[PDB]
Amino acid sequence: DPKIVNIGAVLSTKKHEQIFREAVNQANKRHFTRKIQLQATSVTHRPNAIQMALSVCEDLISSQVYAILVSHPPALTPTPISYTAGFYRIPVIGLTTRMSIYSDKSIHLSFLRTVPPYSHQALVWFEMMRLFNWNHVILIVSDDHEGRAAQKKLETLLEGGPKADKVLQFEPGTKNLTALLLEAKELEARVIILSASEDDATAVYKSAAMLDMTGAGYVWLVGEREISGSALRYAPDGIIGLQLINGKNESAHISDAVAVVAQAIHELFEMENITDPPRGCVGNTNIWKTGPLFKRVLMSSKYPDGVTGRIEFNEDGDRKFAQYSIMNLQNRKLVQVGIFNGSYIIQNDRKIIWPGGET
Amino acid sequence: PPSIGIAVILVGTSDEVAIKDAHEKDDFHHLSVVPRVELVAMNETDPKSIITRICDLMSDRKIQGVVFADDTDQEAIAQILDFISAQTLTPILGIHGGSSMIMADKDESSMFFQFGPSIEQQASVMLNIMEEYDWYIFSIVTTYFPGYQDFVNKIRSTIENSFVGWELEEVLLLDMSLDDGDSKIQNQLKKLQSPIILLYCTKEEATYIFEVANSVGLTGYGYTWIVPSLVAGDTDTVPSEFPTGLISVSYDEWDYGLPARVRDGIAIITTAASDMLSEHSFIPEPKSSCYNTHEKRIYQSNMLNRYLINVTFEGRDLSFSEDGYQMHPKLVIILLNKERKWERVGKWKDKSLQMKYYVWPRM
Ligand SMILES: CS(=O)(=O)Nc1ccc(OCC(=O)CN2CCN(c3ccc(F)c(F)c3)CC2)cc1
Ligand SMILES: *[C@@H]1O[C@H](CO)[C@@H](O)[C@H](O)[C@H]1NC(C)=O
Ligand SMILES: *[C@@H]1O[C@H](CO)[C@@H](O)[C@H](O)[C@H]1NC(C)=O
Ligand SMILES: *[C@@H]1O[C@H](CO)[C@@H](O)[C@H](O)[C@H]1NC(C)=O
Ligand code: NA
């Protein structure tokens, strides 16, 4: 007679479902479970947003889950899960979603994630501008949420060493950007930072080729999106970009996420007057009373010995101490030249070569 | 003329007959096309109830649009309907209750329109009041409830372009997604000096804020709170934590009654589809199923939106804002009196505030 406590998940595949059950199984062993004992409940992504929202109700909230884990769908979004769960104030944990929008508490009020948003790449840029004493940078940005996200996050780090001599924004969809790029040429700053989708970076990459702005002189510093798929195809040689380490290992993040959540469950039932979440959607319109506290507990969990590193959340419930590979395009091969360990840059013995040749 | 399906959803005990009787003008529809309305009743307003219901209706019948009314203080219904609207590409009009409560940032694909003031309309109104009674020093409290930045932005935008001399002391932001066992909302609230206080949040959030603001002496005399429509919500329900002398804007069921609203809902959907058949020789086909909106999506758009926003009927201007609000609604200022009753105290029309009192009597 321990109290059974359900944790839910919506995951890519059945293998991932089995990984999730196992992770919970092992949390029960690892932990002292006379009082409370977790139980895994799961489904995979439904084919559209409406069935997704009904499945959360039918399959998960009917089992009175205390929290819901959510992978990003393969080849559809976490949004209907955030929404449906958010209605009751059941916490949602994103395993693989990097879009910045989910850091907005007005939309996504019960959402944490074990991967950082894309906007947090600005931390790594900043630390590199210190390390490689780039004090004067031009900043090119897609006028969409994801682009503005990144701008704000850097400007915080600049605006209270380095400084941004201008910030240019373009309308996602534009292919002739030589209006914009001519504006970046006439400035004295040679370092260029881009936040753009895969297709928008493609557009930029060519327009900037055409103005010989890809040549020696110039440093190009970029994120993961802008060295993926077709952005990689037309990218200048010497570019520097990022790859979140394990950022797509759903299985790894299932592991760490279960670990954190089980910790936080056990810490929650140290407290008094803990109410159960609602059993099912139907006829249930009041929030879960304890959902906002459980959120607080999670939000200030620390797991230091995690498969993906050191688990902590910032105030938005985004992952902190995420690690990235620093990637340099040399002879149209993407080479790791360094890593961000979560706080420190660590150069490796592979030498960087910049646009031009640069020794 | 050919018949389009319209569903009318009513949540909570309903003058079902007075509504059926105010669409007595079935032969008031001389357009290209004629409504086939079908009243539905719902007992429940959770996400599942609403979705399965509207989706059943969609795969029983051929629904061109939905008119939704409820009796709840449940601003989430607005969000749920928006989502449904955008997923299924389907006009939903939220005419009353939760359905009409401000939903800031609807989808790009939404066909969801609400009867009610915009956030900005109400923020404006709130300044005309404070002008009138020459209240010029004031602070703002909000939560993260969507629209909070639109609110502070319309305020700030207005006061910093003003021959008048406004003096916004403080602007607060309260995080109610996290629990308050450390008294952080307390601390942030003590910080307040101002005589006036604009409060942007939900009715549920308000009750707690006020419970807190009370115990730190901010509901006393020489503090006036002003709140938007959605904090008053349903005026026949008045939480005890609400302080007396609270002021609110309101498009609750005052002059514009539910059956009127239903009738104009059906008007708007029918005339908008009329004008689109009349100018394109087709209207968009009701979606067989919402259990297949993934595939049938190149085949759909929210084309009908341009015709929904610009309607008149029996020569009344029923235009919608581009945010899917009502363009010019007659708002009613209201005051919580000493018997704990929302009493009218003002009427906003032809963009002109028209108060009852000259000075405020004391409750
Ligand atoms: C700091 S404060 O306490 O966070 N205030 C605050 C902030 C944001 C709030 O709502 C934001 C939302 O979008 C939440 N909603 C929940 C309901 N919703 C939804 C939509 C479609 C569904 F199908 C469904 F099931 C649920 C959509 C998302 C409400 C209150
Ligand atoms: C993903 O993570 C798991 C650790 O849980 C590991 O077994 C596997 O090697 C990883 N896969 C890749 C491609 O790194
Ligand atoms: C809604 O409640 C009414 C009144 O009791 C009832 O007649 C109707 O069958 C109910 N609908 C459902 C779906 O339970
Ligand atoms: C809206 O209505 C009237 C005529 O129907 C006209 O003044 C205006 O051009 C219309 N606007 C449109 C079609 O955008
Ligand atoms: Na979050």
Author numbering:
A (entry chain A): 23 to 97, 102 to 186, 209 to 407
B (entry chain B): 32 to 394
Study text:
In the case of morphine, there are multiple cellular adaptations that contribute to the development of analgesic tolerance following chronic exposure. NMDARs are ligand-gated ion channels that are activated by the binding of the co-agonist neurotransmitters glutamate and glycine. Overactivation of GluN2B-containing N-methyl-d-Aspartate receptors is thought to play a key role in mechanisms underlying cellular adaptation that takes place in the development of analgesic tolerance. Herein, we describe a novel GluN2B-selective negative allosteric modulator, EU93-108, that shows high potency and brain penetrance.
Once we established that EU93-108 is GluN2B-selective, we next wanted to confirm that this compound binds at the ATD interface of GluN1b and GluN2B, in the same pocket as ifenprodil, EU93-31, and other previously published GluN2B-selective NAMs. To ascertain the binding site and pose for EU93-108, we utilized protein crystallography and X-ray diffraction to solve the structure of the isolated GluN1b-GluN2B ATD in complex with EU93-108 at 2.85 Å resolution. The crystal structure revealed the binding site of EU93-108 at the GluN1b-GluN2B ATD heterodimer interface, which is similar to that of EU93-31 and ifenprodil. Specifically, the binding site involves residues from GluN1b and GluN2B ATDs, especially around the α3 helix from GluN1b and α2′ and α6′ from GluN2B. The sulfonamide group of EU93-108 forms polar interactions with the backbone amides of GluN2B-Met207 and -Ser208. The phenyl group, the piperazine group, and the difluorophenyl group are in van der Walls contacts with residues such as GluN2B-Pro78, -Phe176, -Pro177, -Ile111, and -Phe114 and GluN1-Phe113, -Ile133, and -Leu135. EU93-108 has similar sets of polar interactions as EU93-3167 but not ifenprodil. The van der Walls contacts are similar between EU93-108, ifenprodil, and the backbone of EU93-31. EU93-108 was tested at 10 μM and inhibition of GluN2B was approximately 18-fold higher than that of the other NMDAR subunits, confirming that it is selective for GluN2B. As anticipated, EU93-108 was also an effective inhibitor of human diheteromeric GluN2B receptors (h2B/h2B) with an IC50 of 260 nM (197, 347 nM 95% CI; n = 10) and with a residual current remaining at 10 μM EU93-108 of 12% (8.5, 16% 95%CI; n = 10).
